[PDB]
Design a protein around this ligand. Sequence first.
Ligand SMILES: Nc1nc2c(CCNCC3CCCCC3)c3[nH]c(NCCc4ccccc4)nc3cc2c(=O)[nH]1
Ligand SMILES: Nc1nc2c(CCNCC3CCCCC3)c3[nH]c(NCCc4ccccc4)nc3cc2c(=O)[nH]1
Ligand SMILES: [Zn+2]
Ligand SMILES: [Zn+2]
Lengths: 344, 344
Amino acid sequence: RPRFSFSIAAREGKARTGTIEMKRGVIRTPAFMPVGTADIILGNTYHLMLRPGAERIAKLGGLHSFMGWDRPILTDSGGYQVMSLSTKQSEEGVTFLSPERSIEIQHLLGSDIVMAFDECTPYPATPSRAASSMERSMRWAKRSRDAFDSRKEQAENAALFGIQQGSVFENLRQQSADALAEIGFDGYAVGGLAVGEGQDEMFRVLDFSVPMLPDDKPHYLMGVGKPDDIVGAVERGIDMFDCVLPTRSGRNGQAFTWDGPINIRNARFSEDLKPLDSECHCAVCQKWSRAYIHHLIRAGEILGAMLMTEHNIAFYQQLMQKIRDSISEGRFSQFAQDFRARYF
Amino acid sequence: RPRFSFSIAAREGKARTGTIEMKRGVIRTPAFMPVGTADIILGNTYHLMLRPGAERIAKLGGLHSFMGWDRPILTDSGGYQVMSLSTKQSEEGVTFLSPERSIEIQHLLGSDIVMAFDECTPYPATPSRAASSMERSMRWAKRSRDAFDSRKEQAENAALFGIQQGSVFENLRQQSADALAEIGFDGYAVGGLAVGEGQDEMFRVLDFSVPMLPDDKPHYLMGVGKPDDIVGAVERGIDMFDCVLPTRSGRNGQAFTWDGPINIRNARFSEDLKPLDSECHCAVCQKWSRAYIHHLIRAGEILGAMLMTEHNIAFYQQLMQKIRDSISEGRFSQFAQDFRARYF
Ligand SMILES: Nc1nc2c(CCNCC3CCCCC3)c3[nH]c(NCCc4ccccc4)nc3cc2c(=O)[nH]1
Ligand SMILES: Nc1nc2c(CCNCC3CCCCC3)c3[nH]c(NCCc4ccccc4)nc3cc2c(=O)[nH]1
Ligand SMILES: [Zn+2]
Ligand SMILES: [Zn+2]
């Protein structure tokens, strides 16, 4: 396969479905990208750079070998997580990480899809602040680009995505898209959302923001989201998603179903013999009832949380497959409406 | 198959290997019986009788259906766990559970191998106290027997095991064996060990205690134990084991290997690319290194503990298979010696 190729096989309104081809494999879009601790998984740049360290992961053969995953891997650039989990900023980078070091770390980890090093602007932000932040991220984008291109193994085998900022402002989203397109990336992420703004506002921003990106490249919405977030985002032309929700939910007793999320610890499930979800083809739903998973989690059994997690991961992939088929078949708008009618 | 049949296919010194046949399946001996939350798994009588309650498990179709396990299930009688996790005693039973109620609960859960309701005498115990306790357990054994026989579905489809007490005293172990044999059970457990006495003392007690049980019935050593405990116990004529160690170890960072247990969190494993154990055929060892499992557990990832747990469960079953084959082949005493040389 090539280093990177994106082909759109079908469209419905703003929604698209197709494929990304890379040397380690094909990614069907729209795609959900789960954390690896699916066609592609997410590595944890921030964590790995601290434990065991990027150099050590390299010494150990790279993330593919480390995690026993030979398919594509995406890494974020780390600053999001530094700012929210670690901080002193400068034009150079963040002390607590610069574009160049971020790209180097992602190279050492060996990821296939590399994210430029950006600043996820805080919400809410004034126009001036949003602009200043966005402008810095675009200088950091060019630095990221240059750093990525300077490493031949990286430039020839991986792909680099640019990240749009601009907060909730249309003119800044536009300038950002402009700067990113001028530099040129393999793909474009919509950053700076899922920062506290709420779904209506996120959708409003996506309505004008996603058409500003190159149509012939994938669009990645970072950190999004609930099942209903994803459907609405795909309606607005997003192709790729990542979110910790399915795995965090699963650790905390929450399961996603076609009828909405459920809290399995609640006593109403203690004698419920139906599977987690009635339609779900996942292994968990093939074998065990809500009553047993309830039992395990209430008892503090690690098995219960693992079963919940597997189910949620599978639910998310089933959702994306249903989105892909419906777009392909020209019935995505009906699916969306049917989905929401039942989910809510 | 029949309700219950035990056949010994080969012997080596005191050690035996063979099979238990029951309606839900065959159990190869010597057998390790893991907790189900293998040819047979253990249900958790004490927990289940409290949550969701035995009657409710019955309403839900019995433990086989609840846990999605159609093979034999063993249940303990609950008093061990009441005394150590819950208490007022009487000849009637324990307030915090009597022989009759214990047997009823085990019936409601639908287990295939039912344990009589006994008292695991505390360690250390004086001869007088050990005797008084043992004598009560033997009256409770007869009550258990009668209760089990009174329920036709139980008496025709399940099996009942008697439990020897007597602490560390030979004469009391003998009287206990005598009373149990007089009542008559499908199998005989050696109770009242793994109570703080240490391996040398446990082996010393097994040396005289196991030959006192009927040779033509299975011998179950309750709550035992580490890999080296099991090998020594099989040397002394034990056929069945249960122990929380593999699952608790796995939750706490400890893995069993042919070279002894290891604490995977230790920094020495952070760059160790060997699997958990080099010989282990388990799925975990087929795919992931010590370095990654180290990483997961240090990060608090539930996946790491699940992988450790699966490995330990598999290690234990590999141990039992190696014990069975060597006894069958007449080389168990060499295996034992080779095992200990490397394990320690
Ligand atoms: N460069 C960059 N990253 C962002 C991220 C991280 C995406 N997930 C990375 C992934 C790497 C592996 C470890 C896990 C994270 C975001 N996450 C969110 N929302 C989360 C909101 C949320 C939703 C559910 C639960 C918690 C938080 N907004 C984000 C905006 C940006 C952004 O502008 N730039
Ligand atoms: N009737 C009865 N039960 C006993 C038990 C419970 C066996 N495991 C049940 C199983 C049911 C499902 C939940 C888990 C337990 C014992 N466990 C131990 N040693 C444990 C010593 C130990 C070893 C490693 C870790 C913790 C404790 N000695 C025991 C003696 C007796 C006894 O005389 N009578
Ligand atoms: Zn499922
Ligand atoms: Zn293994």
